Coordinates of N, CA, C and O in Angstrom, one line a residue:
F23 N -47.6 -86.4 -24.1 CA -47.4 -86.2 -25.5 C -47.3 -84.7 -25.9 O -48.1 -84.2 -26.7
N24 N -46.3 -84.1 -25.2 CA -46.1 -82.6 -25.5 C -45.0 -82.2 -24.5 O -45.3 -81.8 -23.4
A25 N -43.8 -82.2 -25.1 CA -42.7 -81.7 -24.3 C -41.8 -80.7 -25.1 O -40.8 -81.1 -25.6
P26 N -42.4 -79.5 -25.3 CA -41.7 -78.5 -26.0 C -40.6 -77.9 -25.3 O -39.7 -77.2 -25.8
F27 N -40.5 -78.2 -24.0 CA -39.5 -77.7 -23.1 C -38.7 -78.8 -22.5 O -39.0 -80.0 -22.7
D28 N -37.7 -78.5 -21.7 CA -36.9 -79.5 -21.0 C -37.0 -79.3 -19.5 O -36.4 -80.0 -18.8
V29 N -37.7 -78.3 -19.1 CA -37.9 -78.0 -17.7 C -38.8 -79.1 -17.1 O -39.8 -78.8 -16.6
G30 N -38.2 -80.3 -17.2 CA -38.9 -81.4 -16.6 C -38.7 -82.7 -17.4 O -39.6 -83.4 -17.7
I31 N -37.5 -82.9 -17.8 CA -37.1 -84.0 -18.6 C -36.6 -85.2 -17.7 O -35.9 -86.0 -18.1
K32 N -37.0 -85.1 -16.4 CA -36.7 -86.1 -15.4 C -35.2 -86.5 -15.6 O -34.9 -87.6 -16.1
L33 N -34.3 -85.5 -15.3 CA -32.9 -85.8 -15.5 C -32.5 -85.7 -17.0 O -32.1 -84.6 -17.4
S34 N -32.7 -86.8 -17.7 CA -32.4 -86.8 -19.1 C -31.1 -86.0 -19.3 O -30.9 -85.5 -20.4
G35 N -30.2 -86.0 -18.4 CA -29.0 -85.3 -18.5 C -28.4 -85.4 -19.9 O -27.7 -84.5 -20.4
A36 N -28.7 -86.5 -20.5 CA -28.2 -86.8 -21.9 C -28.4 -85.5 -22.7 O -27.4 -84.7 -22.8
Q37 N -29.5 -85.3 -23.3 CA -29.8 -84.2 -24.1 C -30.8 -83.3 -23.5 O -30.8 -83.2 -22.2
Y38 N -31.6 -82.6 -24.3 CA -32.7 -81.7 -23.7 C -34.0 -82.1 -24.3 O -35.0 -82.0 -23.6
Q39 N -34.0 -82.4 -25.6 CA -35.3 -82.7 -26.3 C -35.1 -84.0 -27.1 O -36.0 -84.5 -27.8
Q40 N -33.9 -84.6 -26.9 CA -33.7 -85.9 -27.6 C -34.2 -85.9 -29.0 O -35.0 -86.7 -29.3
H41 N -33.8 -84.9 -29.8 CA -34.2 -84.8 -31.1 C -34.2 -86.2 -31.8 O -35.2 -86.5 -32.5
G42 N -33.1 -86.9 -31.6 CA -33.0 -88.2 -32.2 C -31.7 -88.4 -32.8 O -31.6 -88.7 -34.0
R43 N -30.6 -88.3 -32.0 CA -29.3 -88.4 -32.5 C -29.1 -87.7 -33.9 O -29.3 -88.4 -34.9
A44 N -28.7 -86.5 -33.8 CA -28.5 -85.7 -35.0 C -27.9 -84.4 -34.7 O -28.6 -83.5 -34.2
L45 N -26.6 -84.2 -35.0 CA -25.9 -83.0 -34.8 C -26.3 -82.5 -33.4 O -27.1 -81.5 -33.3

């Protein structure tokens, strides 16, 4: 419950922080 970074998004090639589909 704390992912301020993406240096460990387990791939998640999709986005970086998955803001939630928005621009």
